[PDB]
Symmetry: D2
Subunit: 228 residues, 4 copies
């Protein structure tokens, strides 16, 4: 219970890692706003957050949707103190697949971070944590994301804002449960720990970086992969 009084915005909180993060921050006293791409999803999020938060529909690409969501949050809870971003053959993918991945996984983090920084710097306290993609098989967006975070971290560090990245490994999610046994085994073979990580393990790391315990940790990429 070290987040009382803090407001956290967690994108993609429908399930898996996103939901574990939202429930963990909520269980530790934060008021949580989890987002989904549809209104039904948003309502599902509101149903599990109960009195500890609310779910809102958000399209991370649309700059209009971002402004809209932030306005609803300000009207009901206040300014966002914690932002948690939850997101083929490279010579055969179409320009669409390329732009979609850059837009969704890279540019959106830039637009959201930009939208919440003003309040954070004014209050001289803030946390921006981005969750990297979960290992699903045995790149430019992921690497660009880390480069952006290290750069932003340096820029806003003096104002009391930390910007970090949590890079999960082979974590137990729907996508990994939907893989075939041969596929799972191949990946698991690449994991020293010899087991898959739980969604809660990524959430524990996020909760740590979001707390006052890590005020001096910024521009860091924390890997939670059992040794991959």
């Amino acid at each position: 219970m070290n987040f009382e009084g803090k407001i956290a915005l967690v994108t993609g909180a429908s399930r898996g890692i996103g939901r574990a993060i939202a429930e963990t921050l909520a269980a530790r006293g934060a008021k949580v706003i989890g987002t989904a791409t549809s209104e039904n999803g948003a309502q599902a999020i509101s149903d599990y957050l109960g009195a500890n938060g609310k779910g809102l529909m958000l399209n991370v690409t649309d700059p209009a949707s971002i402004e809209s969501v932030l306005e609803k949050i300000r009207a009901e809870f206040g300014e966002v103190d914690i932002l948690v971003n939850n997101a083929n053959l490279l010579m055969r993918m179409k320009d669409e697949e390329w732009n979609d991945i850059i837009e969704t996984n890279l540019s959106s983090v830039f637009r959201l971070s930009k939208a919440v920084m003003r309040a954070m710097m004014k209050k001289r306290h803030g946390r921006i944590i981005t969750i990297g993609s979960v290992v699903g098989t045995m790149a430019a967006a992921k690497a660009g994301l880390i480069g952006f975070s290290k750069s932003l971290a340096r820029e806003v560090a003096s104002r009391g804002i930390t910007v970090n990245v949590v890079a999960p490994g082979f974590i137990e999610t729907d996508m990994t449960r939907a893989l075939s046994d041969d596929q799972r085994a191949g990946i698991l073979a690449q994991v020293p720990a010899g087991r898959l990580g739980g969604a809660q393990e990524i959430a524990n790391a996020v909760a740590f970086l979001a707390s006052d315990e890590a005020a001096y940790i910024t521009g860091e990429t924390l890997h939670v992969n059992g040794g991959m």
Copy 2:
């Protein structure tokens, strides 16, 4: 003269690093096609390349410009064997300027590499070298570029194509003694690098002498 028979496409060959790279590859026997964002810039390139190449207009942002340039090069010289791809506070950038940077420094390398690969692979030989931006609003694109190259490198390594990145540091390209001193204080070497020094590194990676080097980022910055 170890490039004899090879065709190299160097984007942004108007001056500085780009031109040093184009002149070095040409001096070592390659047929060089340097590009500029205008026909005027292109002619200037033709004039310094002479009998060793030609300058063409390339809008690395238009799929049609890319295809158009590659078609001209095929008619004249053949297939491309060597491809060489040549500020403000973050929270003060507008969506528009962030998009221009990603699209100009990241997506364009993806489009160009894609356009020249099929031929390289059929030929079982190729070189793709990207030059990083010469020293915060470029960090994302820059890091994405390196990530893209390492990933592409693994994908095409078995067909004899290497994909590398050369990351220059401070390169002489004016300032007051105080500004210059501030720069020198950041470089252990104590001087600025020359455009030719980046070109020497590129020439090395493009040669057969670097056939086993791929997915590497070669820093030429005096230990910065």
Copy 3:
């Protein structure tokens, strides 16, 4: 008190980071054994740990000292569950000016010793299918080249060991502190190299160590956690 029932061995717990780590683990329920190179040093540790632990003299350079200390701990508390290798205070110097004497002493104290200690405590960790080994990097001083080799070798050793013992429930990590509070014009020269604009507290390194030693970081291993304020 999420460390209740766990025994932690913290080397170099006399002052600074080492002591903050020892007090933090103790405050969270662990039975702590902090070490010093002298007998008087160990007693000072014993005084501040009170009923939550004890201080023992240990010379990591001496394999006879290591087993001696581990025997005392096993006789009074039990098997070591958490091992924290705390680097001493570094006193900077230039590479091309350091003699075999210093070079050898830094390797021996900063690299080989971690190897010998980790080796000494691993079996008891494996039989329990649970263990934590955390090494603290040399804190950046006021140019720390003479510690650079040993530091990089240490990280390499940890990543490698992490990969070897991960399936047994043991995590091996490294915490790399930046500028820590331990003369104002020189002050500004240091601060200017830190984006956050301030020095870190010894407690901030201890918070990171406490996190990695807990059950919440069971899936974190072979990682180097930098606590340097963006430096």
Copy 4:
């Protein structure tokens, strides 16, 4: 002949990578002194170097003796090129042997040749990493040492770099698809490919490259 007038000391030049490096620098005009642990080794090296150099016996763990011999016959050294089980299984003995042979020796050699380089305000120190756990610390310590030394002597015109080879067809590799399956290039590298990289870093064309680890491993 990019190296005309330069003197290069290459340790472990008996065969493989070491010899390829020695022959390449010699072929490009350098006066080369290759070393070995024995005399047949040193003599074997002098044989293949001919009028381009000489072989000397050198136990890197002797250094001042070798540097003195080179100093009397050729001059100061301008280019210096430095050339298995589970960890919980290692004994203190093996662990120390590895640290001395692969880490401390580079420190001692670099220290022995720096004064000269500094005085001449020009120098090259290249260390070849281990070809492909018990060597994990020495290798990583080596890179850390090089980056640190590189910053220290950069203003004096000396560059310190590391070349990290991947699976290079040697004698071990002669005895497979298992390691090949690890490398994207689908083939093993040649000893000459590591030598080309070393030759490049040792030349004037690489004066602004320092503290860098150049991997030559086929995308591995």
